[PDB]
Design a protein around this ligand. Structure first.
Ligand code: OVC
Length: 282
């Protein structure tokens, strides 16, 4: 499907993706206003960013799931000699923005977690890794439905891992990614654990992974932030238990943060577990 540049009326900016800005447009061929509101992502950039942006479109073109953000079409970008990526508009935005301003119950948070896992199980079956599973990339469709966005770092697993570059969300990353630059399917599960930590804190800035890990590491020696993070995690230190987080949920969180990647559950293993834990607290 092809969106014509002439009928796009920009309303406002939505945010910053990995290789580009996301903006809210009204697409109005009629000139009426009935024409739908769409989230449009555009490239900014150097040579290696162009190669990645084309891959992001290629990835998102092929994905189709109720907990992955809907691809709608492409729009030709005469202004950047590029292709702008048109997606569905989720007015509620990310969980990172939403949860600080809305007191969400534990049961509802566990449903979101289940929903994220279902979307990630799908992604892993299509042989893709996400590589920035974080609360900022989980978009709320409505109160009972979340969708995974931003596949800017997403990559095709051929081989059980992808070898990463030296931008990298280190505070959501497993020791193997930080130490050996190998991203496994099990590395996305580590990130999910951190995303689940984020949910149970209501994405409170003061309890955020960067804030909590930099409290542990210190900033007196910034050059060795990643090495100190690596050492801390290999020592078995972990992000604390969020206030009013059930002990069993924190154990699940800890199982996602197992140092050895094979000891972590797959996203298929997690789905039934979260279903049960959800029904418990509902
Ligand atoms: C709360 O204020 C907002 C902010 C952004 C959105 N909307 C969106 N934001 C992203 C987005 C981003 F802007 C940066 C990083 C990661 C993201 F997922 N992606 C999408 C959408 C969307 O509607 N469709 C895809 C809605 C409300």
């Amino acid at each position: 499907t092809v969106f014509h540049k002439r009928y796009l009326k920009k309303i406002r900016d939505l945010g910053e993706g990995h290789f580009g800005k996301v903006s809210l447009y009204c697409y109005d061929p009629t000139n009426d206003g009935t024409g739908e509101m769409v989230a449009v992502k555009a490239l900014k950039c150097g040579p290696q960013h162009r190669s990645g942006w084309k891959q992001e479109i290629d990835i998102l073109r092929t994905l189709y799931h109720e907990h992955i953000i809907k691809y709608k079409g492409c729009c030709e970008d005469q202004g950047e000699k590029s292709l702008q990526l048109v997606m569905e508009y989720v007015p509620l935005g990310s969980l990172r923005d939403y949860l600080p301003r809305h007191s969400i119950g534990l049961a509802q948070l566990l449903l979101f977690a289940q929903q994220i896992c279902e979307g990630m199980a799908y992604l892993h079956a299509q042989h893709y890794i996400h590589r920035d599973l974080a609360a900022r990339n989980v978009l709320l469709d409505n109160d009972r439905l979340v969708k995974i966005g931003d596949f800017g770092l997403a990559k095709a697993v051929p081989h059980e891992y992808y070898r990463v570059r030296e931008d990298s969300p280190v505070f959501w990353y497993a020791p193997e990614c930080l130490k050996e630059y190998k991203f496994y399917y099990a590395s996305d599960v580590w990130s999910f654990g951190v995303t689940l930590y984020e949910l149970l804190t209501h994405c409170d800035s003061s309890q955020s992974p960067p804030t909590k890990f930099l409290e542990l590491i210190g900033i007196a020696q910034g050059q060795m932030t990643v090495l100190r993070l690596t050492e801390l995690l290999e020592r078995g230190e972990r992000l604390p238990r969020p206030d009013k987080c059930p002990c069993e949920v924190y154990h699940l969180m800890k199982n996602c943060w197992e140092t050895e990647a094979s000891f972590r559950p797959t996203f298929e293993n997690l789905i039934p577990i979260l279903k049960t834990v959800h029904e418990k607290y509902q």
